[PDB]
């Protein structure tokens, strides 16, 4: 499309500053802006999810995503570059997260949160302007049903528009419109008596309806995007991109427990071999110690139970307090610059120098032989063709796919902690 056709298209599609993002895009983009825009939108999503995980309230979320709006993704600024930026970034995200149901759920939730924040951000005129372009009840039906709608919506106006004064509520209720829909679509608002109902028709708290409609349409579109994934999978320019963006979003367990089958049943091969070495030799070398320590932190072992277990495995205390206690406490960030060092991933663990005699660290899909790997897989009750598949994955330099392979057959993962997490989630 010529720049005029695309100009008119985005004028029509972004007549309102907000849209449910209904149709596929129209144009071409150089890969650099592809990455910049995807990263901006993903980072803003990550920050919003960080805000919600700690249960921050609405206005503080607005305030904290305001600067990332002002820096990363401009809003309410008429620059057509801003508009196409946002649109393309969103649909790239739809490409990204459509791969798994957990990821689809999180993406739909988070993009609907974006919808929410953008909506409360906008002006009244432009709010209703988006809402216009699902039937608005007539002004006559409004006047006839005036007292009931006033009674219903007065409390919501008080709590949501800080309209403590009654006169302001009357003035805005005069300005407010009302929509008519069967209550089977707003039963959530019905339960709390947030919307008036009449003869099986709900008068809508309209923002919640708009947001959940958007969310459901988003989920359907995202499932469809996953369905059509193989027809883009020939795009060798985007599969690294989509994998990178997908990975971009990534006591019961006690010192005595980590030796129990209920706890080590979920381990990957690396951690199993590290446990085996720690049990056998009653000592590991620096790399195995660090890998295992940060892993056991990632699964959730307490610092005191960590000291307990590590001290137990060495069947003197003097040398411990002399040399190992400080290092172990430094590992948990409880020393020095106070850096709770995030666990090594399969990538960082592979980035470590290769293991030798007395070493057990690394990715055993690399550091072992096909003989030992295959014997261990047979011990895991795997079939023959499964063994050929795992070894074929290994031989191609692809250790992580072999790991996720053995996972799916004993029950994309490049993190032992998320390996354990998914394994436990399957039991929960």
């Amino acid at each position: 499309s010529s720049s005029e056709e695309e100009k008119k298209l985005y004028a029509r599609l972004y007549e309102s500053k907000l849209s449910f993002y209904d149709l596929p895009p129209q144009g071409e983009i150089t890969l650099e802006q592809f990455e910049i825009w995807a990263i901006d939108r993903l980072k803003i999503l990550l920050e919003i999810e960080s805000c919600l995980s700690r249960n921050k309230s609405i206005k503080e979320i607005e305030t904290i995503i305001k600067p990332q709006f002002q820096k990363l993704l401009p809003f309410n600024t008429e620059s057509l570059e801003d508009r196409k930026k946002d649109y393309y970034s969103h649909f790239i995200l739809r490409l990204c997260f459509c791969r798994s149901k957990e990821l689809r759920e999180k993406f739909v939730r988070a993009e609907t949160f974006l919808f929410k924040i953008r909506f409360n951000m906008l002006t009244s005129t432009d709010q209703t302007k988006f809402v216009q372009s699902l039937q608005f009840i007539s002004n006559e039906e409004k006047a006839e049903l005036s007292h009931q709608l006033y009674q219903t919506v007065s409390a919501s106006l008080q709590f949501q528009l800080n309209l403590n004064e009654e006169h302001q509520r009357k003035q805005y209720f005069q300005q407010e419109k009302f929509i008519k829909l069967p209550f089977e679509n707003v039963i959530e608002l019905v339960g709390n008596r947030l919307v008036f109902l009449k003869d099986g028709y709900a008068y809508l708290q309209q923002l919640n309806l708009l947001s959940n409609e958007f969310a459901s349409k988003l989920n359907q579109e995202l499932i469809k995007t996953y369905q059509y994934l193989p027809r883009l999978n020939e795009d060798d320019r985007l599969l690294p991109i989509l994998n990178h963006l997908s990975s971009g979003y990534t006591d019961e367990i006690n010192a005595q427990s980590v030796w129990s089958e209920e706890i080590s049943s979920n381990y990957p091969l690396c951690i199993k071999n590290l446990m085996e070495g720690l049990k056998k030799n009653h000592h590991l070398r620096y790399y195995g110690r660090q890998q295992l320590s940060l892993f056991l932190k990632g699964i959730g072992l307490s610092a005191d139970e960590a000291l307990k277990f590590w001290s137990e495995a060495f069947t003197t205390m003097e040398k411990f307090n002399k040399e190992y206690r400080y290092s172990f406490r430094h590992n948990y960030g409880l020393e020095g610059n106070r850096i709770n060092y995030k666990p090594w991933d399969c990538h960082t663990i592979l980035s470590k120098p290769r293991p030798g005699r007395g070493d057990y660290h690394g990715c055993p899909f690399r550091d072992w032989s096909h003989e030992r790997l295959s014997a261990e897989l047979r011990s895991m009750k795997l079939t023959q063709a499964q063994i050929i598949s795992v070894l074929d994955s290994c031989q191609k330099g692809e250790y992580t796919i072999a790991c996720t392979k053995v996972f799916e057959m004993t029950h994309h993962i490049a993190h032992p902690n998320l390996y354990f997490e998914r394994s436990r989630q399957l039991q929960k």
Binding site: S154, A155, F183, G191, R193, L197, G200
Partner: protein
């Protein structure tokens, strides 16, 4: 079961068609029983000879996933026990029947002016209750979540303890205002005079005092039903002087409205309503302990009117009432 239960009317009611359908083939009878026709219905009921048989949901398979079942409501006097003097224990009369009459009036008002439902009738429970059956297409296939929504819309009284101030949300939701402007005139004539439960001083301190907000006014009234009702306002105006009279008077109005609701508002059954799978005694079943007929309830019906265990028997008027209802239901099904 051999002579008096009108199987044809019930079959045509629950079949949703003149011809037998999966709405009848795949419905549960209590567990997990189903019939294919009027004839097999009669044969199995006669052979089993049950005290009462309960209506299940329509399923995909002959009784297993539930497809449809009519929206239902069950109400029992037990939740109204702390507010009568005419009857004790499990006895009933037209004085305590006014409670169910008012509750059915409120619920029917909601279901008609509010939910668009049209084909709903009330079935007497046999001893002291009334059962609602809403057979419109929308309610029959209503999901569990939306059934929870409709129930939670209908049952404002969620706390069945009579020793606490309700503290309802203010100002009223429009249905609440409608229900109060319906029930308020009746409240005097029933509770203040005919039942008069607050004439007893101990029942008074147990019920009429906890509904108030002010401890000082509570204690003043304690040291000091229509008479007590007026005395509450009198001592309220006596104890609250100054510019702050207005808020106290308004909240006293609201507390009195809350108590009138607590006394005369629908207190349904909350479990017969939730899940579509659930069971309820079929109409025209016989109560094993009393022997009455669970006859359909009209506006003037009273417990003494229900016949005790055919066209010239007292059962016939209820049979014709059910006939008219089922014909209207079938014509509405054709319309849908």
């Amino acid at each position: 079961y051999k002579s008096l239960y009108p199987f044809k009317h019930i079959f045509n009611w629950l079949n949703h068609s003149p011809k037998p359908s999966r709405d009848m083939i795949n419905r549960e009878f209590a567990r997990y029983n189903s019939f294919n026709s009027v004839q097999d219905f009669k044969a199995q009921i006669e052979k089993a000879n049950p005290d009462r048989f309960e209506i299940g949901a329509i399923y995909n398979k002959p009784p297993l996933k539930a497809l449809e079942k009519e929206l239902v409501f069950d109400i029992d006097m037990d939740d109204y026990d702390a507010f009568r003097t005419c009857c004790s224990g499990a006895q009933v009369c037209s004085k305590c029947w006014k409670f169910i009459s008012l509750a059915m009036k409120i619920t029917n008002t909601a279901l008609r002016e509010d939910f668009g439902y049209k084909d709903f009738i009330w079935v007497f429970s046999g001893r002291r209750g009334a059962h609602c059956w809403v057979s419109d297409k929308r309610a029959r296939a209503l999901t569990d979540v939306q059934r929870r929504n409709v129930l939670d819309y209908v049952n404002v009284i969620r706390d069945r303890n009579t020793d606490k101030r309700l503290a309802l949300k203010r100002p009223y939701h429009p249905h609440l205002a409608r229900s109060l402007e319906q029930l308020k005139p009746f409240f005097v004539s029933i509770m203040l005079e005919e039942q008069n439960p607050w004439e007893d001083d101990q029942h008074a301190i147990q019920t009429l005092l906890p509904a108030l907000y002010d401890k000082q006014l509570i204690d003043s009234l304690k040291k000091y039903s229509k008479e007590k009702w007026n005395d509450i306002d009198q001592i309220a105006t006596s104890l609250f002087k100054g510019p702050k009279q207005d808020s106290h008077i308004i909240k006293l109005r609201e507390c009195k409205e809350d108590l009138v609701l607590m006394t005369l508002y629908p207190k349904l059954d909350v479990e017969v309503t939730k899940q579509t799978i659930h069971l309820l005694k079929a109409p025209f079943c016989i109560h094993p302990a009393t022997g009455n007929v669970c006859v359909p309830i009209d506006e003037s019906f009273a417990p003494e009117k229900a016949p005790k265990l055919v066209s010239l028997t007292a059962l016939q008027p209820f049979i014709n009432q059910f006939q008219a209802y089922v014909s209207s239901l079938l014509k509405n099904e054709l319309g849908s």
